[PDB]
Amino acid sequence: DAASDLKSRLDKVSSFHASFTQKVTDGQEGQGDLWVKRPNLFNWHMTQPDESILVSDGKTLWFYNPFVEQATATWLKDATGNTPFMLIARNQSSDWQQYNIKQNGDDFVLTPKANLKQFTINVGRDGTIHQFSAVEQDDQRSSYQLKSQQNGAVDAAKFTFTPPQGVTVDDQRK
Structure with missing residues (x-):
């Protein structure tokens, strides 16, 4: 069905690098790069307006905001x-x-059955992710438009993170 078909389309590309333009609304205007290596490795690096890194090594999820010298760790x-x-x-x-x-x-439009109010995605049978969006509890909407996507082996270094010297770490991993 639509569920198995969606997972199939995404399973077409096991690893990739894609850049997107971001538009955050609610009732904003940014850019970033997405690196993915299935099963659970990923790195969303915001470039504009504010820089930031959200990276998963498959066990720990790190959020690094260089502007405020802070890095947060949680269990993925x-x-x-x-x-x-x-x-x-x-x-x-x-x-x-x-x-x-x-x-x-x-x-594809996904509405929860019973942390997101909505999630949409336009992905071809070829696995190309042309766009996607999400609506949070606070009705905040984030839409992403594909600029360029490249499929193939990704440098594993993109899925690693070490808290820098002089950065405040908030380790929320119990």
């Missing part, structure tokens, strides 16, 4: 399904189950 398992990057990088039948999915060609 405790972050599942909270961000569109998370859903795309994980792409597990288990995650998709928690949503009611509607498809029409390459467009």
Whole structure:
């Protein structure tokens, strides 16, 4: 069905690098690069306006904000399904189950069954992710438009993080 078809399309590309333009609304205007290596490795690096790195090594999820010299660590398992990057990088039948999915060609709209109010994605049968969006509890909407995507082996270094010298670490991993 639409659920198995979505997971299939994303499973077409096991690893990739894609740049997106971001538009954050609610009732903003940025850019970034996404690196993904399935099962659960990913790195969302915001370039404009404010720089930041959200990176998963498969066990720990790190959020690094160089502007405020802060880095936060949490167990990746405790972050599942909270961000569109998370859903795309994980792409597990288990995650998709928690949503009611509607498809029409390459467009998929997912509404929760019972941390996101909505998640949409346009992905071709070829696995190209042309766009995606997410709506949080606070009705904040984030839309992403593909600039360029390249499929193939990714440098594993992109999925690692070490807190820099002089950076304040908030280790929330119990």
